[PDB]
Amino acid sequence: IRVFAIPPSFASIFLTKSTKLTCLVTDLTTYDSVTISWTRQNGEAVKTHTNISESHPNATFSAVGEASISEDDWNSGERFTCTVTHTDLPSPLKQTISRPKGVALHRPDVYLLPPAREQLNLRESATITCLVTGFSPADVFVQWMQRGQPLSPEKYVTSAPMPEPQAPGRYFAHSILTVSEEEWNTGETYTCVVAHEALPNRVTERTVDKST
Amino acid sequence: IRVFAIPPSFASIFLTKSTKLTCLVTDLTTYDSVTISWTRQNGEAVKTHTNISESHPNATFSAVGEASISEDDWNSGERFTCTVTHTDLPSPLKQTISRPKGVALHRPDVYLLPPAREQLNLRESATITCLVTGFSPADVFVQWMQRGQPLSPEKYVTSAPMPEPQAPGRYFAHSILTVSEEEWNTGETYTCVVAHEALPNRVTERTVDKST
């Protein structure tokens, strides 16, 4: 009997320029006649959700609810909760969601790594690594750009923010992109751009080519 | 009401040259008078476990049991199960554990990446990446060697085997080690050695220095 909510990730916030709240139901049998409403700390309600979900095929029911809010209150840390009503439960369950500020806010550093000389001898593939170290909190966004045009999210893999051993609280993350030699040796540059909330303009780009 | 077992990882098997089986209890209240025994597919028993565990402080009970076996039967895929007896359960629960063979067995490739030129300008740290791509199944072991002497496992971080987008079934993993510039520019070589069960001798070493 759980209902887990999804706080907005800085990745989505920077990608869409619009803060949403999301919560889903779990550990409950599929049913109907369920209403989802978001209530803030004071008590008043917000815009109505849309896009009613379905039931998972694993004897679990899930409902999704959307609410558009300003980013200032979320950054401040207002207490937010969505309301879920069901049949078996006697009292509707409340799910507290909030983001604090005491988390340190250090700007990260960006490093790009060209492929090894010895990998470009099989003439089959190449790998470029964009390396980000030393940021707090644990929300980062990385994407790859080719000739000013975004690449599909199916050609690169991004690691989750995992802590440095040599620090009390700090993190790092990795991303590698798979291209073809003829492209790397004779193609274009795949800039990696990272967006962190501790950055001045929240945007940082680095460029890597064959002759760097 | 679950009891999850730990199949031997190729990492542990290669590290200790001795195959063990392990199973732990969960989702049960702490109690006593519990016996753990391993039974193979035929029905006969094996050596007695040791090192009785304790109870987790989260209202969960756990028992650990050890059994030493040959590697040939485990590689073949014999059906193995440890027996757990408790008070509330009417019938002892059996936990089936076995490793198959239909998993592909491609040898991996090893790549070492020196630190970026631009990171060695802050004169504060350096990072070396050992990159392993294209192996099956999902069991790998990586460790770092300095002047023939193993380094402590608290100075490097190893990724989990996660699949390549450009392949039906294949994986890769990463590892980065943190050293000091004066060490990297004027120190020794930190060889990364990887052990995979598809390799001929199960051992592969690569060497990287300042002048490579």
Residue numbers in the entry:
A (entry chain B), B (entry chain A): 345 to 556
Sentences from the paper on this structure:
Immunoglobulin M (IgM) is the most ancient of the five isotypes of immunoglobulin (Ig) molecules and serves as the first line of defence against pathogens. Natural immunoglobulin M (IgM) assembles into monomers (composed of two heavy and two light chains), pentamers and hexamers. An IgM pentamer is over 900 kDa, consisting of ten heavy (μ) chains, each of which has a C-terminal tailpiece which holds them together, ten light (λ or κ) chains and a joining (J) chain, a 15 kDa polypeptide ﻿with no homology to other proteins, which sterically interrupts the addition of a sixth heavy crystal fragment (Fcμ) unit.
We have also studied the IgM-Fc monomer (defined as Cμ4-Cμ3-Cμ2 dimer) by both smFRET and cryo-EM for comparison to Fc in the pentamer. By comparison, the structure of the Fc fragment in the IgM monomer is similar to that of the pentamer, but is more dynamic in the Cμ4 domain. Intriguingly, our time-resolved smFRET at two different labelling positions showed that the Cμ4 dimer in the IgM monomer is dynamic, yielding two discrete FRET states, which interchange several times per second. We then modified the Cμ4-Cμ4 interactions and captured the ‘closed’ and ‘open’ conformations of IgM Fc separately. The symmetrical structure of the IgM-Fc monomer also supports the idea that the asymmetry observed at subunit 1 in the IgM pentamer is attributed to the interaction with the J-chain. We have also shown that the Cμ4 domains in the IgM monomer are inherently dynamic, but are stabilised by a coiled-coil which may mimic the transmembrane segments.
